[PDB]
Amino acid sequence: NQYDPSLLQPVPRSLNRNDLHLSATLPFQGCDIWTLYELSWLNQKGLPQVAIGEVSIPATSANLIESKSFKLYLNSYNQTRFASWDEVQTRLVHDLSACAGETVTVNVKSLNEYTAEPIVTMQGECIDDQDIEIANYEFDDALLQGAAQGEEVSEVLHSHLLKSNALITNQPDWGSVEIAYHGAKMNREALLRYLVSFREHNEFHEQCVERIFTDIMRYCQPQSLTVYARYTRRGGLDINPFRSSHQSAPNHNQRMARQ
Amino acid sequence: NQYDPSLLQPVPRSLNRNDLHLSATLPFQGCDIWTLYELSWLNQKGLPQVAIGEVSIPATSANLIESKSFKLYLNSYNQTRFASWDEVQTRLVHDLSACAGETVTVNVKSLNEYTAEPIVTMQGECIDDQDIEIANYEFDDALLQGAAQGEEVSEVLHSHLLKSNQPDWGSVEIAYHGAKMNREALLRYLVSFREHNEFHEQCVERIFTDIMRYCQPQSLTVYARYTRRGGLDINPFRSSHQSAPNHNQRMARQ
Numbered sequence A: 001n002q003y004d005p006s007l008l009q010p011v012p013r014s015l016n017r018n019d020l021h022l023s024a025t026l027p028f029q030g031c032d033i034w035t036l037y038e039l040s041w042l043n044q045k046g047l048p049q050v051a052i053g054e055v056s057i058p059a060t061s062a063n064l065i066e067s068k069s070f071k072l073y074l075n076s077y078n079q080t081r082f083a084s085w086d087e088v089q090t091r092l093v094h095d096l097s098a099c100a101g102e103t104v105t106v107n108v109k110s111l112n113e114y115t116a117e118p119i120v121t122m123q124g125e126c127i128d129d130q131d132i133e134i135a136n137y138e139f140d141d142a143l144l145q146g147a148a149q150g151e152e153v154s155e156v157l158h159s160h161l162l163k164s165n166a167l168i169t170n171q172p173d174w175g176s177v178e179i180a181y182h183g184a185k186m187n188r189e190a191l192l193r194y195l196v197s198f199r200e201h202n203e204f205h206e207q208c209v210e211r212i213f214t215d216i217m218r219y220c221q222p223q224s225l226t227v228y229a230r231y232t233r234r235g236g237l238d239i240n241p242f243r244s245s246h247q248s249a250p251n252h253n254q255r256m257a258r259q
Numbered sequence B: 001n002q003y004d005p006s007l008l009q010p011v012p013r014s015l016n017r018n019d020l021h022l023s024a025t026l027p028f029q030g031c032d033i034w035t036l037y038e039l040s041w042l043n044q045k046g047l048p049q050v051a052i053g054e055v056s057i058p059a060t061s062a063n064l065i066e067s068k069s070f071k072l073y074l075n076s077y078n079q080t081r082f083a084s085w086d087e088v089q090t091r092l093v094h095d096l097s098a099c100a101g102e103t104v105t106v107n108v109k110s111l112n113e114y115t116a117e118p119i120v121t122m123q124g125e126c127i128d129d130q131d132i133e134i135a136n137y138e139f140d141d142a143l144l145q146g147a148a149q150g151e152e153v154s155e156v157l158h159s160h161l162l163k164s165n166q167p168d169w170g171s172v173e174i175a176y177h178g179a180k181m182n183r184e185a186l187l188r189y190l191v192s193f194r195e196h197n198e199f200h201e202q203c204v205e206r207i208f209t210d211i212m213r214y215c216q217p218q219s220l221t222v223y224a225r226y227t228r229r230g231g232l233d234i235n236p237f238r239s240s241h242q243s244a245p246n247h248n249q250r251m252a253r254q
Ligand SMILES: Nc1nc2[nH]cnc2c(=O)[nH]1
Pocket: A064, A065, A066, A067, A068, A166, A167, A203, A204, A205, A206, A239
């Protein structure tokens, strides 16, 4: 019914990081960018307000925020009066920061900030148009074995074919992913097979991006690497994890066709 | 599970129209436009394909399609191999038309068709920025009693404050010619959908029939655009005189 920060449920980043054989000292930096498409509350006189929230959670935070719990938390604003949009911003930053364990950035944007904003696609070369046969759908990181044997390049690749399954109901998540790197040129077929092999994998979006980054790192050994995925929303919220050897945030945050 | 048209759930439109007490002949025409943001399947060689679908269901169809069922039906494509994009489009038309009871149109578009496409707002004047107090969110059609007493005008009004109890969210565009409508009454009435249950198509038909009966405009269009639930959205359009909106461009929350 009313505003309730206890609805937020953290999940520690360490669970999956330990599974990736990472140390406490991360091989990447970055953030999880969230879009809150249904943020709504009442003003001081009870008249509903609507906005889109843009949130960034540092990748160094102890916890990620579980997405269903984030949805239920936001729903608790819907019948609650707040003094001003600034109060809503302040409450979001306080609660989300406490749950994540590190200061989170929050922008609460009016809907008119999006009028005539264009849908974007990703940068560089799309690798999806390949005339190849897929014979099974089991996850296989060894699809990247020997995948980076070309000359030294800097380039940006992307795919729209990322899909994994949510941990419990096997309901699908959908994403596009952009991979920018400097290192030995990557075999496009290997990279595309590797990404397609997530199609029945169960992991959070943040975990998926970390696994792609660490698997490219270990098998392809680029000198620099950035992996940025943009997923379609679930429960009115989307996640867009960014992980980079050198960059701390993406220099653009614009929605894709399916988002 | 793979392709399964039995997952689709039709709901007779008469089920909820009965409670509107309509004449024998429908007082509106129009359509329900759906956007399918998560449409994906496998090609013949097993490589995933992704697309966005656009569906228009005539408001005269015997049935609407229940949204959860529509989502589960579309998910059944995800691990199914199809020979071509044209086959996918063809089966969508066939299955959704059989469900609705009337021919539906379906476009299956590659993601590239959306690059640079705009996010849009609605036409006319937004009525949401009022200095009024609302405290009682109960549904109350009587809020429209005597709402249209102004001189004869043509105008278009919109609100982003539709919410219909998990919550669903929409914006709604009302174009009319008739006695000028009191914007406070209209906003209170729309906000009163808040706590209250009905399908999105049902809310648009209730808004149309209530405006028709309380305000008596000579002509009227009511068009709502709801945010997606489960990867697809619905955009019901009802009018005394027009058949459809001019495009299906998405709004900021969609
Ligand atoms: N943060 C987060 N929470 C989830 N809950 C279900 N899936 C996810 C996910 O990918 N990320």
